[PDB]
Structures are given as C-alpha cells and as structure tokens.
C-alpha cells in the first residue's frame, strides 16, 4: 500500500512547471498520475511549487479542516496551483477535465514523523 505522504505527492505535487501548461494540462496530468485508472477522479488540485515549499506549510498557520480536524495548515504565501475538475462530457474511460490555473493559498492536513502533508483540504 502507498503511504499517505506518497499518495499526497502523487496526487498533488507538480514542481516541474511554474503553471498549467495549456487547457489540456489536466487531461494529461490526471492520466499520468494514475487518477483515472478505474474511475475518473472528479476533482484534483496540483501545486506548482517545490516539494520543500509545500512540506513547509505544516509549520505555517494552523487552521481548522473543513471536517473539523485541527491538523490543517494554511500557507502564508500564495502558490501557483491548477484545479482539475471533470466536465459534463467526461465519461469513463474517456475522462475529460477543465483546467483552471490560479495563485492561491493552500490548506493541507499534516501528519506523522516527519510531519508532512497527507491531504489537500482547500485553496484560498
């Protein structure tokens, strides 16, 4: 089984681009990070920052999670992100995503030793 930290990295990290690199970015990335294998993942955010910058957020501003948990952290600075959401024309096995680039604060849930991101909660 994949560790929680490894699943967070696979699903949410894309340090190799500064920003969503076209309207087809989400279709490409959702397949290659294997988020469309048995089912189209409906919603997913990619962060275009270093892994170290994202990991640093677990030491930034402690806020509530949407679920009421108390192990969420909001980035002090905005970060380049891309939101991917399935469109109405999406039907597995032909998944189809809208790509939305933005620069927002991120909110992540953290856990473990090392204390690292395990869940992407939200962006602001």
Question: So which residues are the catalytic ones?
Answer: 12, 119
Which long-range CB contacts under 8 A does 31-37 form with residues at least 24 apart?
Answer: 31/95, 34/10, 35/11, 36/92, 36/93, 36/95
Instruction: Please give the sequence-ordered ranges of beta strands (E in DSSP) within 10-74, or none if there are none.
Output: 43-47, 61-63, 72-74
Q: Looking at 59, 62, 69, 77, which residue binds Cl ion (CB under 5 A)? A: 77
Q: Which is nearer to Cl ion, 5 or 65 (CB)?
A: 5
Using the rule CB under 5 A, is 103 a contact of Cl ion? no
Q: Rule CB under 5 A: is residue 45 a binding residue for Cl ion?
A: yes
User: Would you tell me which residues interact with Cl ion (CB under 5 A)?
Assistant: 3, 5-6, 15, 44-45, 50, 77-78, 112-113, 120
């Amino acid at each position: 089984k994949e560790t929680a930290a490894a699943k967070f990295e696979r699903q949410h990290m894309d340090s190799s681009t500064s920003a969503a690199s076209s309207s087809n970015y989400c279709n490409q990335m959702m397949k290659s990070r294997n988020l469309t294998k048995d089912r189209c993942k409906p919603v997913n955010t990619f962060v275009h920052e270093s892994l170290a910058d994202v990991q640093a957020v677990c030491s930034q501003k402690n806020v509530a999670c949407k679920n009421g948990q108390t192990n969420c952290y909001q980035s002090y600075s905005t970060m380049s992100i891309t939101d991917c959401r399935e469109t109405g024309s999406s039907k597995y096995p032909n998944c189809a995503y809208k790509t939305t680039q933005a620069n927002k604060h991120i909110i992540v849930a953290c856990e473990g030793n090392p204390y690292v991101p395990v869940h992407f909660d939200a962006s602001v």
